[PDB]
Amino acid sequence: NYGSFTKEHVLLTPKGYREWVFIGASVTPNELNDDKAAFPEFHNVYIDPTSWGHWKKTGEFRDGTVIVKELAGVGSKASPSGNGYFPGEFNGIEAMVKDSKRYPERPGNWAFFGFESYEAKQGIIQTDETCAACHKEHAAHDMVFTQFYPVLRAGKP
Amino acid sequence: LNYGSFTKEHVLLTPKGYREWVFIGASVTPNELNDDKAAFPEFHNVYIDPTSWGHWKKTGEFRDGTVIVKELAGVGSKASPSGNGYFPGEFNGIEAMVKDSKRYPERPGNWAFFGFESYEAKQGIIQTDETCAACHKEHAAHDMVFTQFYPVLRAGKP
Ligand code: HEC
Ligand code: HEC
């Protein structure tokens, strides 16, 4: 079980998630979003190893699934490989945890967490309006935007 | 504990399970920003093997036996509920590089670079130094790897 939680079932700030299973990266640069992306700017997304094993067998997110979206800045727009976007420095993380026992009234049993900094002890749980509304509305599978996770789409049975 | 499988002629066999290796960073060179034909289209998701990641945490150096896989994917869209930008589509192919001072004593940095004809190919095709190493040698921040674009590596070294 890769998440740890407070008494009130708040996700403690994940550690070592960069050693979890990467499932996809997207980029919303500030310069293409009126100088402020909602989630600036590169997004590197990870699912915990245990939930990955379960996804390879079921194509479903189990209770205990932790997904971390790590934000990084655009570091440059041209390299020897051509023009585009290339990452810079880390900016922070978002996370979501699915758990029908801890979050029985949350849409999809998912809890969404923001993090004040990489130094924070624990996440801040989010109201449904702030995160779950957009994800339920538009994500291809169980409030996870799998249309942007080719690792997931190719790993499911 | 090495992650590269090789023929007897030291040819790297097509890496399997590298999507469970340690992701070190992602970039994108969209076709539309490169004359409709990027050199490596389009998203690049880069992995380093778990043993060499463990060694990199300790030393900030690539051990003998390092395998790095660059997985290419398409731009699947440019707009999503999160904003405008680039979002990946389907998998396009892989590039790889393997460090080995005994198998590859005459290659710059002892790196062998491999292209792969498709995801079905049994093995890679080792590349001449002109085709890959020359660019990597000449611009990569560290030991022919573009660590300026791998924040995972930079933050994970001592
Ligand atoms: C990516 C995200 C992830 C990664 C898993 C996933 O479902 O994709 C997490 C854990 C997370 N966000 Fe989310 N989000 C949105 C989109 C389109 C993507 C994938 C493409 C990309 O990386 O840009 C996400 C969309 C939205 C959004 C639409 C207006 C809302 C308001 C949010 N997301 C809000 C939140 C959170 C509230 C602070 C939060 C903790 C999220 N998302 C977590
Ligand atoms: C990315 C790459 C990687 C990942 C490791 C790394 O050093 O970044 C591999 C294994 C690989 N390529 Fe290379 N390449 C270049 C640049 C700037 C980046 C990182 C930024 C990005 O992802 O876009 C690379 C540069 C170049 C280049 C400059 C003109 C050439 C000709 C090549 N690369 C050629 C090759 C290969 C020849 C077929 C090959 C097997 C590569 N790269 C592997």
The three-state DSSP-derived secondary structure of chain B is CCCCCECCCCCEECCCCHHHCEEEEEEECCHHHCCCCCCCCCEEEEEECHHHHHHHHHHCCCCCCCEEEEEEEEEEEEEECCEEEEEEEEEEEEEEEEECCCCCCCCHHHEEEEECCCCCCCECEECCCCCCHHHHHHHCCECCECHHHCHHHHHHCC
DSSP conformational letter for A30: G
Distance of CA A131 from the midpoint of ligand 1 (Å): 7
Site to substitute for ligand 2 among B135, B136, B148, B152, most atoms within 8 A of C-beta: B136
Annotated binding site of A for heme c: 43, 69, 81, 131, 134-135, 145, 149
All residues at 6 or more sequence positions from A91 whose CB lies less than 8 Å from its CB, including other chains: A40, A41, A71, A72, A73
* Cα of A1 from ligand 1 centre, angstroms: 23
Q: Find the A144 Cα to ligand 2 centroid distance in Å.
A: 31
Q: Residue of the nearest CA to atom 23 in ligand 2?
A: A81
CB A33 within 8 Å of CB B84: yes
Number of other CB atoms surrounding residue A131 within 10 Å: 20
Task: Return the SS3 of A93.
Answer: strand
- Cβ atoms of B109 and B140 within 8 Å: the answer is no
d(CA B75, CA B79): 11
Report the alpha-carbon angle B59-B20-B48, nearest 5: 30
Report A:43-102 residues touching B (Cβ under 8 A).
Answer: 43-44, 46, 52, 72, 75, 79-90
Q: Which two tokens stand for residue B12?
A: 């790297």
CATH number of the domain bearing residue B73: 3.50.70.20
Domain range for A53 is 1-157
8 A C-beta contact, residue B157 and residue A93: no
Q: Which residue of B has its CA nearest to A76?
A: B149
> Coil, strand, or helix at residue A39?
coil
Structural domain count of chain B = 1
| Structure-block tokens of residue A31 | 């310069």
Q: What is the distance between the alpha carbons of residues A86 and A69, in angstroms, rounded to a whole number?
A: 17
Contact B20 A21 (CB under 8 A): yes
Residue B43 with chain A: CB contacts under 8 Å:
25
Burial B88-118 (b: 16+ CB within 10 A, else e): bbebbbbbbbbbbeebbeebebbbbbbebee
Interface test with A, best of B16, B23, B35 (most A CBs within 10 A): B23
Residue of A nearest to B37 (CA): A82
Method: X-ray
Going from the C-alpha of B31 to that of each of A31, A84, B50, B110, the distances in angstroms are 19, 9, 31, 31
Instruction: Determine contact: A34 vs chain B, CB below 8 A.
Output: no
At B74, the amino acid letter reads G
Q: Tell how far CA B14 is from the center of its chain.
A: 13
**Which residues make beta-bridge pairs with A68?**
A46, A95
Q: Tell me the C-alpha distance between A31 and A6, whole Å.
A: 38
- Who contacts A128 (Cβ-Cβ below 8 Å, separation ≥6)? A106, A107
The DSSP code for A121 is S
CA distances to A35, B19, B76 from A150, rounded to whole Å, are 28, 11, 10
Instruction: Say if residues B113 and B95 touch (Cβ distance below 8 Å).
Output: yes
Q: How far is B114 from A84, CA to CA, in rounded Å?
A: 24
Find, among B51, B114, B40, B97, the residue nearest to B73 by Cα. Answer: B40
B23, B86 Cβ separation under 8 angstroms: no
Which token pair is B93? Answer: 């192919």
Q: Where are the alpha helices (DSSP H) in chain A?
A: 49-58, 132-138, 150-155
Q: Residue ranges of A for the binding site?
A: 43, 69, 81, 131, 134-135, 145, 149
B:98-117 residues touching chain A, CB 8 A cutoff: none
Select from B21, B40, B48 the residue to mutate for testing ligand 2; criterion: most ligand atoms less than 8 Å from CB.
Answer: B40
Residue in B115, B131, B138, B152 with CA at minimum distance from that of residue B15: B115
- Which distant-in-sequence residues (6+ apart) come within 8 Å of B21 by Cβ? B3, B47, B48, B49, B50, B53, B67, B69
Q: What CA–CA distance (Å, rounded) separates B127 from A7?
A: 56
Give the up-direction half-sphere exposure of residue B158: CA atoms within 13 A in the CB hemisphere: 8
Q: Taking the CA of residue B37 as centre, how many other CA atoms within 13 Å lie in the half-sphere pointing to its CB? A: 0
